[PDB]
Amino acid sequence: GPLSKKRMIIRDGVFYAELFEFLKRELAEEGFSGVSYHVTTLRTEIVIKATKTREVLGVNGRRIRELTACIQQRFNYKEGKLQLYVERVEVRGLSAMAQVESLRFKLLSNLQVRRAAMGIIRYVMESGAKGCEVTVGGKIKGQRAKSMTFRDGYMIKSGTAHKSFVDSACRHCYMRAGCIGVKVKIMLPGDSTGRNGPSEPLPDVITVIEPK
């Protein structure tokens, strides 16, 4: 023989890294939001997080059926070993990966860049987020490229704690004149159970408790 434990953490990471890229390309307009796979004997689980569960599932599961066997034929799984599921994100406003793919389609449908980006930030900040930041960079106005950022709320950026609290995703928008890249950063509010956001408070918030 078996690979070492050091050699198996590598191939289990490159498994998840390749599985993540396949579903990011497929389920972009299904509002894809992540994978968790659970491996055991007799079955390998794959749970897909999405915003459009009627579309990542087919009419009778047709879409996930094809999407199952694409993972089966590639990674050489046998019959019965690989089962896939779809779960939906409960909020849709706290998932930076879903919102950037929608903002990708708001530009590709030839809407105005600033009207599209404030439509994200209004939708993200009404969904309970503490803060949001949309950056659109590219040939926005003309021949020479610009960069615009649009901001509201809090945003922690310098800590290493911003990996816990700030959700980020960057995609490319293929315009007719060039290439535009969009970024969406969402600061996760709450959810002590870990539904969306950490349990512990921010590293500098002290919050002295009141006496009985």
Binding site: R7, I9, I10
Partner: protein
């Protein structure tokens, strides 16, 4: 005639190896038999599991 890829059939060289993500054969990380290109790894270190602690 099928002399067609006779040098690429034997697989000893820097041309036999390849970035498994990014299809390039320049500057690949072969430590831990990882076989990802240098640039195409930093995009994918978080999904493989590597995080820059220090």
């Amino acid at each position: 005639l099928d002399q067609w890829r006779s040098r690429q059939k034997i697989g000893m060289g820097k041309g036999a190896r390849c970035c498994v993500i990014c299809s390039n054969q320049k500057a690949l990380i072969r430590k831990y038999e990882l076989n990802v290109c240098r640039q195409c790894f930093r995009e994918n270190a978080e999904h493989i599991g590597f995080t820059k602690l220090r």
